[PDB]
Amino acid sequence: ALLSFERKYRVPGGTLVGGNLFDFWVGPFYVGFFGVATFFFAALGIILIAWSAVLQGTWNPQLISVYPPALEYGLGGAPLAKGGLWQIITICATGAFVSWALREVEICRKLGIGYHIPFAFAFAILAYLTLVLFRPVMMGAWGYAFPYGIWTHLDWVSNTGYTYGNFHYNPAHMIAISFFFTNALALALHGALVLSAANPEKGKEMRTPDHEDTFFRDLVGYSIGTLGIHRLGLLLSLSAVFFSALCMIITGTIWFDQWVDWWQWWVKLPWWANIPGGING
Amino acid sequence: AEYQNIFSQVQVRGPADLGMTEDVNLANRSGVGPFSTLLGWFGNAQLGPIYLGSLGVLSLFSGLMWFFTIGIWFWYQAGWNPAVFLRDLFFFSLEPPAPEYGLSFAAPLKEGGLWLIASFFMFVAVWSWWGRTYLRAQALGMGKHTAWAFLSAIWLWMVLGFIRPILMGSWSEAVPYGIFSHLDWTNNFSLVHGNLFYNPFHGLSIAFLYGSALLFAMHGATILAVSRFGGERELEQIADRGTAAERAALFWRWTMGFNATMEGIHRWAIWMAVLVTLTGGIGILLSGTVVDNWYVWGQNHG
Amino acid sequence: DLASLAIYSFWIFLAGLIYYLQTENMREGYPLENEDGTPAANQGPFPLPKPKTFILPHGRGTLTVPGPESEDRPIALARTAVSEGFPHAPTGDPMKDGVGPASWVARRDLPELDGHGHNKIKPMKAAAGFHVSAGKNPIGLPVRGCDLEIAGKVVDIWVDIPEQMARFLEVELKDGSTRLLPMQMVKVQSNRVHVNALSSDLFAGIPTIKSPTEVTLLEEDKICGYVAGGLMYAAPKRKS
Ligand code: BCL
Ligand code: BCL
Ligand code: BCL
Ligand code: BCL
Ligand SMILES: CC[C@H]1c2cc3[nH]c4c(c3C)C(=O)[C@H](C(=O)OC)c4c3nc(cc4[nH]c(cc(n2)[C@@H]1C)c(C(C)=O)c4C)[C@@H](C)[C@@H]3CCC(=O)OC/C=C(\C)CCC[C@H](C)CCC[C@H](C)CCCC(C)C
Ligand SMILES: CC[C@H]1c2cc3[nH]c4c(c3C)C(=O)[C@H](C(=O)OC)c4c3nc(cc4[nH]c(cc(n2)[C@@H]1C)c(C(C)=O)c4C)[C@@H](C)[C@@H]3CCC(=O)OC/C=C(\C)CCC[C@H](C)CCC[C@H](C)CCCC(C)C
Ligand SMILES: COC(C)(C)C/C=C/C(C)=C/C=C/C(C)=C/C=C/C(C)=C/C=C\C=C(C)\C=C\C=C(/C)CC/C=C(\C)CCC=C(C)C
Ligand SMILES: COC1=C(OC)C(=O)C(C/C=C(\C)CCC=C(C)C)=C(C)C1=O
Ligand SMILES: CCCCCCCCCCCC[N+](C)(C)[O-]
Ligand SMILES: CCCCCCCCCCCC[N+](C)(C)[O-]
Ligand SMILES: CCCCCCCCCCCC[N+](C)(C)[O-]
Ligand SMILES: CCCCCCCCCCCC[N+](C)(C)[O-]
Ligand SMILES: CCCCCCCCCCCC[N+](C)(C)[O-]
Ligand SMILES: CCCCCCCCCCCC[N+](C)(C)[O-]
Numbered sequence: 001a002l003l004s005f006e007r008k009y010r011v012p013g014g015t016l017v018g019g020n021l022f023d024f025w026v027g028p029f030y031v032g033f034f035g036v037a038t039f040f041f042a043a044l045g046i047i048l049i050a051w052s053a054v055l056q057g058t059w060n061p062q063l064i065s066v067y068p069p070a071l072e073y074g075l076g077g078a079p080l081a082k083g084g085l086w087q088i089i090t091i092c093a094t095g096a097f098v099s100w101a102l103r104e105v106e107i108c109r110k111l112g113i114g115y116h117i118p119f120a121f122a123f124a125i126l127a128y129l130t131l132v133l134f135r136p137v138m139m140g141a142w143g144y145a146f147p148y149g150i151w152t153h154l155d156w157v158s159n160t161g162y163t164y165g166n167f168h169y170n171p172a173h174m175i176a177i178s179f180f181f182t183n184a185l186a187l188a189l190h191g192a193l194v195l196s197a198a199n200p201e202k203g204k205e206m207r208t209p210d211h212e213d214t215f216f217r218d219l220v221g222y223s224i225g226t227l228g229i230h231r232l233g234l235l236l237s238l239s240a241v242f243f244s245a246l247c248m249i250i251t252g253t254i255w256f257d258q259w260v261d262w263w264q265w266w267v268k269l270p271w272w273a274n275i276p277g278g279i280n281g
Numbered sequence: 282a283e284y285q286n287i288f289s290q291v292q293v294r295g296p297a298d299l300g301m302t303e304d305v306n307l308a309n310r311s312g313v314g315p316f317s318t319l320l321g322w323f324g325n326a327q328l329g330p331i332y333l334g335s336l337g338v339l340s341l342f343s344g345l346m347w348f349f350t351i352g353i354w355f356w357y358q359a360g361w362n363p364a365v366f367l368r369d370l371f372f373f374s375l376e377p378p379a380p381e382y383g384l385s386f387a388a389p390l391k392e393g394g395l396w397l398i399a400s401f402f403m404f405v406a407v408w409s410w411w412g413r414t415y416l417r418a419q420a421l422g423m424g425k426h427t428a429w430a431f432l433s434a435i436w437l438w439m440v441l442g443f444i445r446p447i448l449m450g451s452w453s454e455a456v457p458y459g460i461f462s463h464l465d466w467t468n469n470f471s472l473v474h475g476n477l478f479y480n481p482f483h484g485l486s487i488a489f490l491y492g493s494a495l496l497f498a499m500h501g502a503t504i505l506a507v508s509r510f511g512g513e514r515e516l517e518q519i520a521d522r523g524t525a526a527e528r529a530a531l532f533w534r535w536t537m538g539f540n541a542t543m544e545g546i547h548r549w550a551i552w553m554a555v556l557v558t559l560t561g562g563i564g565i566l567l568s569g570t571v572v573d574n575w576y577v578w579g580q581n582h583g
Numbered sequence: 584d585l586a587s588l589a590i591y592s593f594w595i596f597l598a599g600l601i602y603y604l605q606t607e608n609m610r611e612g613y614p615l616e617n618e619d620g621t622p623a624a625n626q627g628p629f630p631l632p633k634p635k636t637f638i639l640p641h642g643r644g645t646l647t648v649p650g651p652e653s654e655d656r657p658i659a660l661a662r663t664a665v666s667e668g669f670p671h672a673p674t675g676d677p678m679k680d681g682v683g684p685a686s687w688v689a690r691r692d693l694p695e696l697d698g699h700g701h702n703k704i705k706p707m708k709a710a711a712g713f714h715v716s717a718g719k720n721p722i723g724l725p726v727r728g729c730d731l732e733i734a735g736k737v738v739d740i741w742v743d744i745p746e747q748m749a750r751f752l753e754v755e756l757k758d759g760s761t762r763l764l765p766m767q768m769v770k771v772q773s774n775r776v777h778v779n780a781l782s783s784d785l786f787a788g789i790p791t792i793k794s795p796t797e798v799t800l801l802e803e804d805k806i807c808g809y810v811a812g813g814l815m816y817a818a819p820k821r822k823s
């Protein structure tokens with residue numbers, strides 16, 4: 001039940017709510033007030049999903065789907081079997097996610113580390129909330145939110161995207177994708193670099209960070225360094241999610257036509273709008 | 282406000298660092314570039330040196346030729362008019378030969394010939410650049426992980442521009458060179474293959490792409506959270522575990538009930554990332570060669 | 584069909600990969616232990632991998648993992664409950680004993696070395712010709728703790744030669760001796776360096792280094808552990 005070095009760190013303290021009341025573990029899992037909150041929110045949410053499954057009339061995980069209130073309900077309540085369960089499951093999900101972050105904070109305080117992890121997680125929660133809470137509210141109905149189902153959430157992505165034509169043309173989406181791709185590139189390179197240094201050619205001694213800097217300077221003329229790369233991966237991946245939430249919060253609110261047409265502002269600039277030739281004259 | 286180690290408070294500099302020598306041919310290294318104080322708030326201030334060498338020159342020249350072959354075509358499409366070139370920059374497109382030319386090199390310059398020449402230059406640029414990731418690790422006595430990982434990106438690229446077109450029987454299947462046209466190509470590829478969302482390899486690829494952001498957010502944030510105990514000195518934490526690596530592991534053990542090591546996190550990392558393009562390239566390679574319509578295939582569960 | 588085969592193969596490959604990855608990640612800290620240090624009955628479903636050996640540079644030896652785990656230091660904690668899973672209370676002063684958030688690991692009592700075999704971390708004064716290149720220079724600034732009292736003054740920066748970065752501030756105390764404070768645990772301001780982790784009276788208790796121009800992995804762990812530990816244990820004297 002304990003890692004070999006673990007005991008020295010399992011002291012009292014660090015909780016945000018309840019003093020020592022929930023200051024303990026279960027196997028490897030820290031508990032805390034927010035561990036109790038997470039369990040409660042998650043347990044309810046799962047039970048409601050199973051109830052939703054019964055009212056839909058299936059137990060196949062590829063078929064279970066919990067749909068938000070139809071558009072006619074606006075931002076009000078709905079009968080449970082017609083959107084209300086979705087509404088409650090969503091409160092449960094949010095409670096669980098926020099609880100999970102706050103429990104992470106408690107672990108941080110006990111361990112004497114920085115809060116960077118729950119802070120980064122909060123970006124993911126904010127993206128979820130953009131799709132199920134902020135965007136639906138700004139747009140006037142719960143029904144614009146995605147449904148909770150494995151394949152049905154994908155139908156939603158598709159239908160939402162095609163509502164605006166090829167969603168590729170959302171410029172905030174373009175920035176988002178760039179961050180995603182760049183992040184995966186950086187992850188591949190960080191992983192490969194450290195490993196290539198820790199596991200050198202057969203019989204050779206472990207390389208050093210100097211070799212890591214040297215390899216990258218040789219390769220491309222720059223190295224961000226070992227603090228830099230962990231700053232980078234954090235930045236790239238949080239920026240991707242930031243721009244993801246941006247690209248959706250502005251869709252169906254400030255912009256709601258075909259995203260391809262947005263790009264006409266550049267082509268129609270007076271100085272060149274009317275010069276013939278090229279693609280657009 | 283506690284200091285968060287996102288940006289440095291104080292930069293320091295000393296003699297330009299010329300790097301480790303090992304077996305590198307030193308005749309092929311530039312001198313150091315300038316130092317960027319701007320960069321230095323976030324990473325290293327030093328630029329260069331860089332390694333030239335014959336493979337390096339080849340790859341660079343070839344990559345430029347690719348870039349310039351597309352750009353000349355763009356100027357041509359613009360009727361040599363600077364203002365139209367800028368106006369229409371994202372709209373230009375160097376397109377591959379029409380279906381009727383099959384896999385032959387007999388299409389005219391203006392209808393595919395130029396695309397083939399650009400592609401040829403891209404091919405040698407990328408492969409010789411791959412050779413470089415291998416050789417720079419070799420000269421330093423390092424493992425080959427970088428070249429192995431690059432090979433996974435190269436796989437999707439090769440599939441899209443070369444392997445899949447050859448299997449389909451024509452260059453017209455490849456991707457055009459253009460900002461907007463490549464996006465239209467992407468949208469159209471999905472539409473024509475009955476929606477990529479039904480390709481299990483596309484879904485896997487997404488799981489990994491998202492998974493990379495999840496993982497790098499986790500790792501990046503963890504290292505920073507333990508940088509007050511020297512966390513980012515990963516290689517020496519591998520060789521001689523410190524309290525940084527232990528607090529890291531325990532954060533995760535307490536949160537989600539398992540954890541990594543200082544070396545092993547980097548193995549999760551490399552694989553989360555390369556599997557994006559490994560599953561990706563498979564999903565594309567199967568598209569139209571074996572499976573015409575992912576929705577249809579999915580209805581037969583296969 | 585070929586796509587069916589590929590997808591089925593992929594899931595098998597991925598099960599094997601997760602297996603490989605999880606076992607690779609058990610090269611440290613395993614086997615699991617009870618709170619008393621003995622092997623736990625339940626090790627889980629993953630077995631330890633075959634050992635691997637890292638060759639350390641500069642004649643520092645090798646590391647083989649997995650291998651026999653031990654703390655190599657006394658842990659001043661005691662049970663607070665009669666069953667597994669509860670916190671372990673400090674038996675003395677947790678800051679001085681190095682437990683909880685003040686923990687340190689028994690790392691090699693040698694300095695980390697660069698690729699040339701030189702000490703990786705040096706006071707700037709002994710590092711040719713390193714100087715502050717941007718940002719406020721902390722050298723000379725009074726150093727303040729979370730009790731808003733002055734604990735001493737910055738007399739140097741300890742820098743990482745190969746990576747050209749600031750790692751510690753060397754701080755001089757009322758009695759003329761110095762301590763290292765981790766760079767990540769200070770706030771450089773225009774008229775002061777502020778340290779939220781420690782009240783002024785806890786500065787004397789920072790673990791000292793044995794040679795004035797080098798610091799060992801062991802010493803770094805004790806310094807960083809002790810300063811972090813103040814977040815929790817200096818809380819009664821804070822104050823912001
Ligand atoms: C994966 C499925 C599709 C496709 C779908 C998408 C989608 C969807 C998007 C992109 C976007 C990008 N794609 Mg694409 N992309 C594919 C094929 C690729 C290939 C290739 C196979 O060689 C290339 C070069 C590009 C590159 C481009 C970039 C223009 C852009 C940012 C990528 C990035 O952050 O990379 C990693 C970052 C780097 C460090 C290197 C990349 C730097 C860029 C600037 C170089 C690319 C080409 C360069 C010549 C552009 C110059 C611009 C002007 C001419 C001055 N794509 C395939 C065919 N691509 C995004 C975009 O913004 O489009 C406009 C976007 O939303
Ligand atoms: C045909 C469909 C359209 C499309 C329509 C849309 C639509 C619509 C959307 C996107 C969005 C996304 N698209 Mg798109 N877009 C398409 C083409 C692409 C292409 C491509 C190569 O062609 C790419 C790369 C992308 C990429 C992007 C990303 C920027 C973004 C998704 C990531 C995200 O928001 O994460 C953010 C992360 C989350 C939301 C996850 C949060 C999870 C946390 C908080 C909780 C989960 C925990 C719990 C349930 C787990 C259980 C516990 C267990 C123990 C595990 N799109 C085509 C053109 N795109 C989406 C977006 O930006 O959303 C903001 C979006 O809504
Ligand atoms: C982010 C932008 C879009 C969207 C875009 C798409 C697209 C496009 C795809 C997915 C796919 C996935 N999406 Mg989705 N997805 C949305 C947001 C959600 C949310 C949420 C906010 O709560 C969740 C939990 C999921 C989760 C799912 C998974 C079923 C699947 C793999 C994702 C992954 O590996 O992530 C990376 C994170 C990890 C690797 C951590 C692992 C955690 C995963 C496995 C959690 C599974 C939980 C799931 C079974 C929910 C049950 C929870 C229980 C009731 C407790 N999506 C929004 C609406 N998603 C892919 C798929 O194949 O679907 C069929 C796919 O192609
Ligand atoms: C309407 C569009 C379709 C769709 C059609 C496509 C198509 C088509 C493809 C993808 C592909 C992917 N899609 Mg999709 N996609 C859709 C919906 C989405 C959504 C969503 C709806 O939220 C998401 C998140 C994604 C996610 C993604 C990625 C997982 C995946 C490509 C990963 C990658 O890293 O490639 C980026 C990396 C590369 C392209 C490799 C780079 C190779 C190197 C060698 C290039 C170097 C070039 C160098 C010379 C340039 C130098 C210039 C610099 C300035 C130096 N898709 C919808 C259903 N998608 C790709 C895939 O694999 O699918 C299975 C793909 O071909
Ligand atoms: C912001 C950058 C990226 C990121 C960061 C991030 N994610 C994080 C964290 C961070 C730093 C963690 O600290 C935390 C973690 O503990 O990781 C292991 C986490 C986490 N991210 C997770 C998933 C996840 N993150 C995602 C993405 C991202 N996370 C971004 C790409 C995605 C995507 C891309 O879809 C997924 C699916 C979990 C592994 C974990 C959070 C675990 C958690 O909050 O648990 C508490 C609650 C439960 C145990 C389940 C509650 C169940 C609900 C009550 C009911 C389910 C409702 C749901 C809405 C239905 C969805 C159905 C689907 C078919 C759509
Ligand atoms: C594992 C999946 C991810 C991945 C990984 C990956 N990519 C790789 C590698 C890895 C491991 C590297 O080793 C390799 C690399 O060297 O990275 C630094 C690389 C790389 N991936 C790159 C880009 C890239 N990767 C892609 C993404 C991905 N790669 C996936 C997300 C994408 C996307 C998402 O579309 C892009 C665009 C390059 C940075 C690099 C490959 C470099 C290359 O093949 O070069 C050949 C061509 C040239 C040498 C020059 C090209 C011409 C330029 C247009 C000219 C402009 C600048 C010029 C150099 C100025 C010179 C001026 C002179 C006159 C002085
Ligand atoms: C300012 O003006 C100048 C001229 C100075 C500079 C301007 C230049 C400009 C504007 C260039 C713009 C470049 C752009 C927009 C390029 C964008 C391209 C994109 C987005 C690429 C995306 C897909 C690329 C793929 C998938 C291509 C892969 C290619 C291969 C796999 C090569 C296959 C090899 C072939 C077909 C040749 C076979 C030959 C043999 C025998 C090996
Ligand atoms: C611990 O090692 C790490 C660093 O520190 C020595 C890095 O320097 C880099 C290299 C990152 C850079 C500079 C990428 C910039 C270049 C392009 C073309 C995107 C990686 C991957 C890394 O893991
Ligand atoms: C794909 C990334 C390529 C990066 C290449 C950077 C080019 C810099 C060239 C420097 C020129 C060297 N020299 C000796 C002539 O000065
Ligand atoms: C992807 C990052 C690319 C950065 C390229 C930086 C090139 C620096 C090369 C140094 C050469 C400078 N010079 C003229 C002194 O030789
Ligand atoms: C991604 C690399 C680009 C780095 C440029 C960002 C510069 C930010 C400067 C931070 C400000 C430093 N300051 C004043 C607080 O000391
Ligand atoms: C490095 C290993 C991490 C494992 C990631 C787990 C991905 C599961 C997502 C399921 C994808 C669903 N589908 C049908 C598209 O294959
Ligand atoms: C893809 C998600 C599947 C859920 C399982 C995730 C792994 C959690 C670790 C299991 C913990 C078991 N333990 C340590 C209490 O025995
Ligand atoms: C997609 C990643 C799947 C994560 C699950 C992998 C391991 C889960 C739990 C590992 C067991 C921990 N244990 C018992 C060895 O301590």
Ligand SMILES: [Fe+3]
Binds near residue numbers: 515547
């Ligand atoms: Fe790392």
